[PDB]
Each structure stands twice: as structure tokens, then as C-alpha cells.
Amino acid sequence: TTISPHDAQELIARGAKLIDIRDADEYLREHIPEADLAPLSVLEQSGLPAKLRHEQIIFHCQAGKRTSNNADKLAAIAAPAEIFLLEDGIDGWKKAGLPVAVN
């Protein structure tokens, strides 16, 4: 299931984890302040660490593609949470007028 940036904000205000699945170099250039970084490759190797588990988990990447294309991987990695994909990624978040942190 996809979630709008504004609806994601409301879930994050209730404790939902926002997980950035991009690489560290991408994150460092520009990220969502509320997000926790966990590159997809690392998640595929060692799983989601306990500190990033919650009842509600929202994954995001750049523009919606890596989340859409790895939907089954992400559904398993965060199971048994309620899982969302941020619609249009950080690009969508920016287009919605929500804050980002730029290097």
C-alpha cells in the first residue's frame, strides 16, 4: 500500500518508522529529517534491526521505483508490521512541501 507524504506525517507523529532504503551518499546529500537510513542491500543481508521495528513501518526511496519493484522483499523484511511505501519517494515528499535536509 502506498501512503501520501501528508498521511505518512500523521503516522510518524504516532511513532511509525520512516525507513530510507537508499545509500548513505544519497542520504547525506538530501534526506527526510524523520527518516532512519537502512540501505536495501543491508536489509536483504542482515534484516531489519530491532531498533527500527514498530507496529507501522513506511519505506521510501528516491522517486517510488525501488519500493514498487522490491515490494515483496520489503513486505518480508518488515513483517509482521503494517507496511507502507511512500508515494513517489523523497521526490514526492518534496513536491508536497514537506521539509528535507540538504548538505
Curated annotation (Swiss-Prot):
Domain (Rhodanese): residue spans on this chain: 12-102
Segments on the Cytoplasmic side according to the record's topology features: 1-103
Membrane-related topology note: Multi-pass membrane protein
Main localization (coarse): membrane
Record field: catalytic activity: thiosulfate + hydrogen cyanide = thiocyanate + sulfite + 2 H(+)
Top-level lineage group: Bacteria
Localization of this protein: Cell inner membrane
Summary of activators and inhibitors of this protein: Sulfur transfer activity is inhibited by S-nitrosylation of the active site residue Cys-61. S-nitrosylation competes with S-sulfhydration and causes small, widespread structural and dynamical alterations.
Induction comment: Part of the ygaVP operon, which is repressed by YgaV. The operon can be induced by tributylin (TBT), a toxic chemical used as a biocide and in textiles and wood preservation.
Enzyme class: transferase
UniProt GO cellular component terms: plasma membrane
Keywords, in A-Z order: Cell inner membrane, Cell membrane, Membrane, Transferase, Transmembrane, Transmembrane helix
Enzyme Commission number(s): 2.8.1.1
The protein's role, per its UniProt record: Transferase that catalyzes the transfer of sulfur from thiosulfate to cyanide to form thiocyanate. May have a role in the detoxification of cyanide to the less toxic thiocyanate. May also be involved, directly or indirectly, in the transport of the thiocyanate produced across the membrane from the cytoplasm to the periplasm.
Subunit and partners: Homodimer.
Domain remark text: The catalytic reaction induces conformational changes within the rhodanese domain, as well as in the transmembrane alpha-helices.
Protein name per its UniProtKB record: Thiosulfate sulfurtransferase YgaP
UniProt source species: Escherichia coli (strain K12)
Taxonomic placement: Bacteria, Pseudomonadati, Pseudomonadota, Gammaproteobacteria, Enterobacterales
Primary gene name: ygaP
Full-sequence portion shown in this chain: 4 to 106 of 174
